[PDB]
Design a protein around this motif. Structure first.
Motif, PDB file in Angstrom:
ATOM      1  N   UNK A  41       0.825  -1.204   0.000  1.00  0.00           N
ATOM      2  CA  UNK A  41       0.000   0.000   0.000  1.00  0.00           C
ATOM      3  C   UNK A  41       0.861   1.257   0.000  1.00  0.00           C
ATOM      4  N   UNK A  42       1.940   1.256   0.783  1.00  0.00           N
ATOM      5  CA  UNK A  42       2.834   2.412   0.807  1.00  0.00           C
ATOM      6  C   UNK A  42       3.443   2.644  -0.569  1.00  0.00           C
ATOM      7  N   UNK A  43       3.796   1.565  -1.267  1.00  0.00           N
ATOM      8  CA  UNK A  43       4.400   1.723  -2.586  1.00  0.00           C
ATOM      9  C   UNK A  43       3.408   2.310  -3.579  1.00  0.00           C
ATOM     10  N   UNK A  44       2.150   1.867  -3.529  1.00  0.00           N
ATOM     11  CA  UNK A  44       1.153   2.472  -4.410  1.00  0.00           C
ATOM     12  C   UNK A  44       0.931   3.942  -4.062  1.00  0.00           C
ATOM     13  N   UNK A  45       0.985   4.277  -2.770  1.00  0.00           N
ATOM     14  CA  UNK A  45       0.868   5.675  -2.366  1.00  0.00           C
ATOM     15  C   UNK A  45       1.998   6.515  -2.947  1.00  0.00           C
ATOM     16  N   UNK A  46       3.226   6.005  -2.894  1.00  0.00           N
ATOM     17  CA  UNK A  46       4.343   6.743  -3.474  1.00  0.00           C
ATOM     18  C   UNK A  46       4.194   6.862  -4.982  1.00  0.00           C
ATOM     19  N   UNK A  47       3.662   5.821  -5.625  1.00  0.00           N
ATOM     20  CA  UNK A  47       3.404   5.900  -7.059  1.00  0.00           C
ATOM     21  C   UNK A  47       2.450   7.047  -7.361  1.00  0.00           C
ATOM     22  N   UNK A  48       1.401   7.194  -6.552  1.00  0.00           N
ATOM     23  CA  UNK A  48       0.459   8.284  -6.800  1.00  0.00           C
ATOM     24  C   UNK A  48       1.047   9.641  -6.442  1.00  0.00           C
ATOM     25  N   UNK A  49       1.978   9.687  -5.491  1.00  0.00           N
ATOM     26  CA  UNK A  49       2.568  10.954  -5.082  1.00  0.00           C
ATOM     27  C   UNK A  49       3.749  11.377  -5.946  1.00  0.00           C
ATOM     28  N   UNK A  50       4.226  10.511  -6.838  1.00  0.00           N
ATOM     29  CA  UNK A  50       5.408  10.824  -7.631  1.00  0.00           C
ATOM     30  C   UNK A  50       5.138  11.797  -8.771  1.00  0.00           C
TER      31      UNK A  50
ATOM     32  N   UNK B  12      -1.610   0.679 -12.576  1.00  0.00           N
ATOM     33  CA  UNK B  12      -2.951   1.262 -12.557  1.00  0.00           C
ATOM     34  C   UNK B  12      -2.910   2.723 -12.118  1.00  0.00           C
ATOM     35  N   UNK B  13      -2.187   3.003 -11.036  1.00  0.00           N
ATOM     36  CA  UNK B  13      -2.066   4.376 -10.566  1.00  0.00           C
ATOM     37  C   UNK B  13      -1.321   5.241 -11.574  1.00  0.00           C
ATOM     38  N   UNK B  14      -0.357   4.658 -12.289  1.00  0.00           N
ATOM     39  CA  UNK B  14       0.342   5.414 -13.323  1.00  0.00           C
ATOM     40  C   UNK B  14      -0.606   5.810 -14.448  1.00  0.00           C
ATOM     41  N   UNK B  15      -1.514   4.909 -14.823  1.00  0.00           N
ATOM     42  CA  UNK B  15      -2.529   5.261 -15.810  1.00  0.00           C
ATOM     43  C   UNK B  15      -3.423   6.381 -15.296  1.00  0.00           C
ATOM     44  N   UNK B  16      -3.797   6.316 -14.016  1.00  0.00           N
ATOM     45  CA  UNK B  16      -4.570   7.405 -13.424  1.00  0.00           C
ATOM     46  C   UNK B  16      -3.829   8.733 -13.541  1.00  0.00           C
ATOM     47  N   UNK B  17      -2.526   8.723 -13.262  1.00  0.00           N
ATOM     48  CA  UNK B  17      -1.742   9.950 -13.335  1.00  0.00           C
ATOM     49  C   UNK B  17      -1.663  10.473 -14.762  1.00  0.00           C
ATOM     50  N   UNK B  18      -1.532   9.569 -15.732  1.00  0.00           N
ATOM     51  CA  UNK B  18      -1.505   9.996 -17.127  1.00  0.00           C
ATOM     52  C   UNK B  18      -2.821  10.650 -17.528  1.00  0.00           C
ATOM     53  N   UNK B  19      -3.945  10.107 -17.056  1.00  0.00           N
ATOM     54  CA  UNK B  19      -5.229  10.755 -17.320  1.00  0.00           C
ATOM     55  C   UNK B  19      -5.286  12.140 -16.685  1.00  0.00           C
ATOM     56  N   UNK B  20      -4.799  12.257 -15.447  1.00  0.00           N
ATOM     57  CA  UNK B  20      -4.788  13.555 -14.780  1.00  0.00           C
ATOM     58  C   UNK B  20      -3.926  14.568 -15.527  1.00  0.00           C
ATOM     59  N   UNK B  21      -2.878  14.108 -16.210  1.00  0.00           N
ATOM     60  CA  UNK B  21      -2.076  15.022 -17.012  1.00  0.00           C
ATOM     61  C   UNK B  21      -2.754  15.417 -18.314  1.00  0.00           C
TER      62      UNK B  21
END
Lengths: 50, 50
Positions: A41-50, B12-21
């Motif tokens: 979970x922490x790793x996914x959080x960092x992915x979203x915060x990067x 999955x979170x990276x795809x979310x970030x790409x959409x946000x960009x």
């Protein structure tokens, strides 16, 4: 026969000890898996915060 | 399996970030189009005043 009785009693006691050891290992592995989930979970959080 | 889990829940979170960009790019392009309309009007006014 007396020495055989000693051997048999010792073997039963050692089997009991081995069962206890298995219990210890499983009890530790549970918390290990939990901490692994927390790290994921922490790793996914960092992915979203990067 | 755990490493695959990490990679999947990161992608999955990276795809979310790409959409946000993509959203930011679109929001900028809108204002750019409005400014372009204003400049076209200014050019027409200039050719009128020439």
């Amino acid at each position: 026969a007396n020495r055989f009785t000693s051997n048999i009693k010792g073997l039963t006691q050692a089997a009991r000890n081995a069962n206890d050891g298995i219990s210890v290992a499983q009890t530790t592995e549970g918390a290990l898996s939990e901490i692994n989930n927390n790290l994921q979970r922490i790793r996914e959080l960092t992915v979203q915060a990067s």
